[PDB]
Amino acid sequence: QNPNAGLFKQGYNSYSNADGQIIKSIAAIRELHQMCLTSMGPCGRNKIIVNHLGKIIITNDAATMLRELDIVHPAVKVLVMATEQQKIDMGDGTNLVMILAGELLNVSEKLISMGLSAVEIIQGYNMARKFTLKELDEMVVGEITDKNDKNELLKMIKPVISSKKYGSEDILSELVSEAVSHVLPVAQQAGEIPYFNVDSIRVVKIMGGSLSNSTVIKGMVFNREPEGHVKSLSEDKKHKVAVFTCPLDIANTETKGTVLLHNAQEMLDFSKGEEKQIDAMMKEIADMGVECIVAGAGVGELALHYLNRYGILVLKVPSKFELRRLCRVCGATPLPRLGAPTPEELGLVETVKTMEIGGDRVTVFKQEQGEISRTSTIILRGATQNNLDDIERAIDDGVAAVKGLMKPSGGKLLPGAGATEIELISRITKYGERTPGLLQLAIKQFAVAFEVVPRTLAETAGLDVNEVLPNLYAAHNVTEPGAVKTDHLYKGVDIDGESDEGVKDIREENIYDMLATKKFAINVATEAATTVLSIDQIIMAKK
Amino acid sequence: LLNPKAESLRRDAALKVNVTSAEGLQSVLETNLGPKGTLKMLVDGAGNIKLTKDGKVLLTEMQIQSPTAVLIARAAAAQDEITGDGTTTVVCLVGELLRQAHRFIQEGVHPRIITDGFEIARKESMKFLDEFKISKTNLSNDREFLLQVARSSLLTKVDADLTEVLTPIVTDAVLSVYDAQADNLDLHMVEIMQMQHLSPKDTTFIKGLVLDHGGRHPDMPTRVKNAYVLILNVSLEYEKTEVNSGFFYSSADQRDKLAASERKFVDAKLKKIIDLKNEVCGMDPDKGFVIINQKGIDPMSLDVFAKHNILALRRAKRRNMERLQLVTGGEAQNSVEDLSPQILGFSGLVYQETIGEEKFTYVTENTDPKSCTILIKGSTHYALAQTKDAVRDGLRAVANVLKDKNIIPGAGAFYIALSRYLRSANMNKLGAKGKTKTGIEAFAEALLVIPKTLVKNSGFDPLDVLAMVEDELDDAQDSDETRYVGVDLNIGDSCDPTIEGIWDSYRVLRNAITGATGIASNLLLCDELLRAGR
Amino acid sequence: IVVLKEGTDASQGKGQIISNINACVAVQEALKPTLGPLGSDILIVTSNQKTTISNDGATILKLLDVVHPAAKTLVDISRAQDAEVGDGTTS
Amino acid sequence: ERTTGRQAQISNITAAKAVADVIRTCLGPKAMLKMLLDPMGGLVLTNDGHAILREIDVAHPAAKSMLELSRTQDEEVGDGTTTVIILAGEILAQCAPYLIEKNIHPVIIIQALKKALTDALEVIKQVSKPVDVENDAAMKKLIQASIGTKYVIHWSEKMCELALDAVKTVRKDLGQTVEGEPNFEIDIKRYVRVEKIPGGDVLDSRVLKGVLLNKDVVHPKMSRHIENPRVVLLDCPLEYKKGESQTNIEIEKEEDWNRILQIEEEQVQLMCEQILAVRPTLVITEKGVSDLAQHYLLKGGCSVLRRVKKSDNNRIARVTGATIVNRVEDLKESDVGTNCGLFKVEMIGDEYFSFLDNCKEPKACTIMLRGGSKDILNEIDRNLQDAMAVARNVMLSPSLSPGGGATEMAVSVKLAEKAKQLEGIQQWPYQAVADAMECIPRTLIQNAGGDPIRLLSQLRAKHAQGNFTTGIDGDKGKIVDMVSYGIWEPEVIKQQSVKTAIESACLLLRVDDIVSGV
């Protein structure tokens, strides 16, 4: 009896802009926005994710959560793909792009209820984004000289470890910066050849001990056992290593060469045949001067027995990804065939031994000041495997953070912990009053949308929101005898753990975010926020 | 009057439903009209997101149960096959023309007089179309004017920040493939290829051709200022004997002898290739040699070619090998035995852009390439789809300017003037009919939908901006001169569309008025809506 | 017509934190009588149909197989109490 | 299951009224479009009367009889399909209150419809005007009615030449009180059958007198034209025959092949020698022809055409005079190639043809159609059929009737004038026939938009005083004379429309019961 208007399409559901889908889309995103509000910051919260495979994990990072969540609704998919856009090109800012673009839509609703057109809302953010990106170039304080010093790496890595794993910040900083300095070569004024691969730093973890027992070695570390009867090599430097793609066994013919059995007389000759040939092959290989054979394939029983009499360390590496990085260290090259270890194909390694880590013995691969290595490994130790795995995720994001320091002006930095946020708000309001027209309403709301980051750090830390907000405003608003406002821009949002009062200077704890991450996060989050406002209707149809 | 399993809409309520159904589609598609419009999102249910403001691309991806909108979707399909742009504009013209006629339908006016009044006004619209149109010179030095045509096409489908990026790309794409001395152009010569892992503002124009698979070796040269290009069909990798045989080696050194003896057939062809580089301009500076060779190349030949500093490509698409014949000019060499320096082509700077996941090879700076490439960059999939839709619509819009020498000013200059013309003309002419005056006046009032919609998506008052234009037209008419007036969407006042650089194609507006009139008339000609099997 | 989940249940808020505590109290309430040498014994029936009676919190809690994710944390510390020490997994 | 009593009379009226009501707006050049939603999801917006009802499935049997009536009506006249359905449906609609509310017996009405049919046909002959069928300029302006509003309007002068030259060959004009009058019988179906040739121009379309065959000559190098052709038609193919016994040929030894091959070459040569005895220049075999028979007739100086249909040989026999013969040894001396102009191998558009055409008309021609594509050929085809249909109606009677509702209203006035002296119970259903005649000009006004009550009252009063030739204009919709704007349809359209309408009206009134099941 009661008719229905607005839907002529196949009994589907399509929200017209007159029904306020944009307000409904922001409300659906607000549910996801509140998830990240308890994430960012060292005081943030961890979320338990129960996988469909029956595995329970817990992580702070929201980008890992979005991958474990099934995203369908179109307004949410925009920020998920925008989060993946933040995941590429940098290893930090996952919680930054989600909270920022979420608040830009929150303040946009107050303009929609006012009646301000969505196109005039997008035009306001685009003009305010260019004002922000231009101002952030002048808001830079220091710049990393790319000296590659350990102390210079401690300045960048320390704030990256924060907001993910807290309390391990100073302990993991010495472990990460040591392995990075091993991969970073010694050069200056050369920007043509890129370097510092992420895969160049391997992270292994063994249960037992604590972070105090964790060390840093130069080389790859393998979990597999020393299959051969030789547990470790001598202390003499530069041992030759041969990488074999072919398994260790009697050689075959490139044409056919299929083993067939007819009479028992042939079976007795097959055993003695493989006995004499393998003994002849392993001999000549060991006679070439190579004391370590890395086999990418299986190892025969007789082939392993003869190499044990010659004192040859046998270590099997079935993973081809580890053999590629092994070539960048020892210098050896994989041979598809077997029996011809050319000395030009042979590499050199100083020390190959087997060490007991966490109670289990593993054969490592390393060096001391020779046959330089482009690959390093971090050995982590801990009692809880769960939290120890989250340490590996914080280190991998710290390695990607060092990759953020490169030629495209990565060394530029800005004070973090809400110090730049509050200062940028007052600088955008300076642009608001100077820009006439209706843009003033959108520019001011664009600056208010940056209040979510400082309020987030104060809310998750247990601090009083009503007390911290004016302390941030009164600190960055001062009266100076001149145009430039002088001594102290360093007042941030203070995460205490202590008792008494107030905010702190960024120079005290040296906790800051680089300009490359913050400038890229704002440009992507604003473009993603203006994108959601561009869709006033969605239509689903059969493919 | 019924049988089993039948439904019929008979009286005038049938036409009221068809118009109302068309009025529902109008309200949906009027939001994306113009550069101030909105960007609609589509979901196929499998998780694919597509962002486009084009009318047909939306209508083809949506399934419509309403039979009236299906005819509009079929009509918008013929508009892209002819005009290629303005499918949304046709929808806005059909719907409002039915709404304005619906007012007269309730008055008791028969639809024939309504449809005949639209055909008479369409004939007068074509007469005004020839007088209002502007004849643009065929000169190719008009790029300054082409910068205005590019903005008219780009500003609709982009945020207007990608306009400055895509304006030199699209404009250089059309004129480069455009043949001199007033010949035609081929849009197929401009290749559109999408890539990931870079921002959309980094989109650049490629004068030559780009290839996917690059040379894999650490010592390959980064850039070569000038090089001689070789197109080879011969496999440079390890091969096998043409007849069945086998390699039986007593020792490991004998196996290398049998392997080198078989590669010697390839090595004999390899020596002829490397010696040809020293044969022509070997010691000469600003000279090089590149191997685009189609079939595979073993790492043994890659090490030899690296010592000579020769770029070696392998595993190339068969279609791209034929494109290099036009772009580079070098002929395809089927056999190295017949290889000669006259077969090789010449190219300009060839530099390999190295990204970790993807390696790029640039054939650009060619003497007579006659083929362009537009490399579209984006991080996500929807960023590539929105830009590609702007490029495909941007290349055809500029192509219609060189093909059709007639141009029309945009910003509603043709719509507002023709609406004012037909209203004042029929009163002075009076040569149609007395009852036709309703159909003529309804069509003139239906032409105002576009200038009212452009300011509706902009948010400005449509009544205020229309009165300012009517005051300027009346002042220009009393001044006895020719002044083209249009609506400025940014400021909100009027503007001269010739100075502001907002231009619409002649073929787009010619088939829009004729197309929208014929489709909207056929909907009014429907007496009864029959439904069978429902 | 679109959904944000496809049947993935996720709940948050301060009420969820309290709900996670009540799930740990239910696990705690079961292990309270087993504290001490004179403590009571729990009667456990495994899905294998084998029935065991013991007061050791390690053996007990490993047979509960608590599905609740936050209450699973009490199982992790029970294995750590059984590893570093081996006694007192109830306390 | 079963419908009896007056309930079946109600269902017969409802069925015929529902079928007509759809196409009532489909009459006239201003006819409104119809939207038919298909059960598969598609729709058809075309206003073509026959194309709509063909895609509409109906249940009641009387509704199917109205569909089969239009199929038979389309075979007579090419246009006016909606005119007959409205008239046949309105007569039952006008007789509906008399059949039920007035309780008139159906046989009384059916008997009155027979008298109304005779009176209506006499009025049509009175209002009709004579026309000259021998005037070429007059025949072109007639066929033009079925031409305009089509793609062939530009070639219309050639479209009439294809239609006129075709009907002039088939027509037999004779009359007398001795052997009777054929009444100018012309068969467009069988004899006038068109042949569509791709390529060329519409101006190149010719009317060929003769038969046309697409099968080529069995040999590439042959005489391209024959001065004095001698045609030989036969049934039995030319090949080595088989015995009446179980004899089979299996050759293993190599020297035994020439023994059977010599017999095969001899028997085929004897079959070809019987043909060459009369020294023919042309050989046409209904069945296939063996390669050996092709060579013997190759050196004999005669063209061979294999595989010709038997229905073709009968038409070949008329353009030639060759006597049909079954067995190759039975060939009669009465078989001749006389009255055959030339044999042409000419190729048009990479397609070999065969031309048996002569200088005389053997009552049957062949239309050769050319164009720019196959879609143009199909457009010329159906448009030529409508061009020949109107030409056929004019050649089957030399009279024209005014259209646009002039004849429909003129009959309704004359029926009402005669109804005054028709007193008795048959007068009531008789007056319903004249009221049904006014429905045709009513739908033209309803499709025009003018006031139906005001115009029909002035239109009927115009016939009562002024001439009967004053009709309604299609484009305008105002009362005008058919002298100024002619719109002259042939009477055959009006003849069959009134005859089939009364027969359909008597058909539905004759069925008082409906029973289902086998």
Swiss-Prot record, chain A:
This protein's UniProt keywords: ATP-binding, Chaperone, Cytoplasm, Isopeptide bond, Nucleotide-binding, Phosphoprotein, Ubl conjugation
Annotated Gene Ontology cellular component terms: chaperonin-containing T-complex; cytoplasm
InterPro entries: Chap_CCT_theta, Chaperone_TCP-1, Chaperonin_TCP-1_CS, Cpn60/GroEL/TCP-1, GroEL-like_apical_dom_sf, GROEL-like_equatorial_sf, TCP-1-like_intermed_sf
One Pfam family, short name: Cpn60_TCP1
Crosslink (Glycyl lysine isopeptide (Lys-Gly) (interchain with G-Cter in ubiquitin)) position: K9
Gene3D superfamilies registered for this protein in UniProt: GroEL (3.50.7.10), GroEL-like equatorial domain (1.10.560.10), TCP-1-like chaperonin intermediate domain (3.30.260.10)
Gene Ontology MF term list: ATP binding; ATP hydrolysis activity; ATP-dependent protein folding chaperone; unfolded protein binding
UniProt superkingdom: Eukaryota
CDD domains linked to this entry: TCP1_theta
GO biological process: chaperone mediated protein folding independent of cofactor; protein folding
Localization: Cytoplasm
Modification type Phosphoserine: residues: S499
NCBIfam families given in the database record: chap_CCT_theta
Function description: Molecular chaperone; assists the folding of proteins upon ATP hydrolysis. Known to play a role, in vitro, in the folding of actin and tubulin. In yeast may play a role in mitotic spindle formation.
Subunit structure: Heterooligomeric complex of about 850 to 900 kDa that forms two stacked rings, 12 to 16 nm in diameter.
UniProt family annotation: Belongs to the TCP-1 chaperonin family.
Name recorded for this polypeptide: T-complex protein 1 subunit theta
Species this protein is from: Saccharomyces cerevisiae (strain ATCC 204508 / S288c) (Baker's yeast)
UniProtKB/Swiss-Prot annotation, chain B:
Principal location class: cytoplasm
Biological-process GO terms, alphabetical: chaperone mediated protein folding independent of cofactor; protein folding
SUPFAM superfamilies documented for this protein: GroEL apical domain-like, GroEL equatorial domain-like, GroEL-intermediate domain like
Matching Gene3D superfamilies: GroEL (3.50.7.10), GroEL-like equatorial domain (1.10.560.10), TCP-1-like chaperonin intermediate domain (3.30.260.10)
Keywords: Acetylation, ATP-binding, Chaperone, Cytoplasm, Nucleotide-binding, Phosphoprotein
One GO CC term, this protein: chaperonin-containing T-complex
Residues where Phosphoserine is found: S245
InterPro entries linked: Chap_CCT_zeta (IPR012722), Chaperone_TCP-1 (IPR017998), Chaperonin_TCP-1_CS (IPR002194), Cpn60/GroEL/TCP-1 (IPR002423), GroEL-like_apical_dom_sf (IPR027409), GROEL-like_equatorial_sf (IPR027413), TCP-1-like_intermed_sf (IPR027410)
GO molecular function, one term: unfolded protein binding
PROSITE patterns noted in UniProt: TCP1_1 (PS00750), TCP1_2 (PS00751), TCP1_3 (PS00995)
Transmembrane segments: none
Nucleotide-binding listed as a keyword: yes
Domain of life: Eukaryota
Subcellular location as annotated: Cytoplasm
Protein family (similarity comment): Belongs to the TCP-1 chaperonin family.
Assembly notes: Heterooligomeric complex of about 850 to 900 kDa that forms two stacked rings, 12 to 16 nm in diameter.
Function summary: Molecular chaperone; assists the folding of proteins upon ATP hydrolysis. Known to play a role, in vitro, in the folding of actin and tubulin. In yeast may play a role in mitotic spindle formation.
This protein's name: T-complex protein 1 subunit zeta
Gene that this sequence comes from: CCT6
Swiss-Prot record, chain C:
Compartmental location: Cytoplasm
Domain of life: Eukaryota
Its job: Molecular chaperone; assists the folding of proteins upon ATP hydrolysis. Known to play a role, in vitro, in the folding of actin and tubulin. In yeast may play a role in mitotic spindle formation.
Subunit structure: Heterooligomeric complex of about 850 to 900 kDa that forms two stacked rings, 12 to 16 nm in diameter.
Family label: Belongs to the TCP-1 chaperonin family.
Protein name: T-complex protein 1 subunit eta
Organism: Saccharomyces cerevisiae (strain ATCC 204508 / S288c) (Baker's yeast)
UniProtKB/Swiss-Prot annotation, chain D:
GO molecular function: ATP binding; ATP hydrolysis activity; ATP-dependent protein folding chaperone; unfolded protein binding
Annotated SUPFAM superfamilies: GroEL apical domain-like, GroEL equatorial domain-like, GroEL-intermediate domain like
The keyword Oxidoreductase is annotated on this UniProt entry: no
A GO BP entry: chaperone mediated protein folding independent of cofactor
UniProt cross-references to Gene3D superfamilies, sorted A to Z: GroEL, GroEL-like equatorial domain, TCP-1-like chaperonin intermediate domain
Localisation: Cytoplasm
A GO CC term assigned to this protein in UniProt: chaperonin-containing T-complex
Disulfide bonding pattern of the chain: C359-C365
PANTHER family on file: CHAPERONIN
Family per record: Belongs to the TCP-1 chaperonin family.
Protein purpose: Molecular chaperone; assists the folding of proteins upon ATP hydrolysis. Known to play a role, in vitro, in the folding of actin and tubulin. In yeast may play a role in mitotic spindle formation.
Descriptive protein name: T-complex protein 1 subunit gamma
Organism of derivation: Saccharomyces cerevisiae (strain ATCC 204508 / S288c) (Baker's yeast)
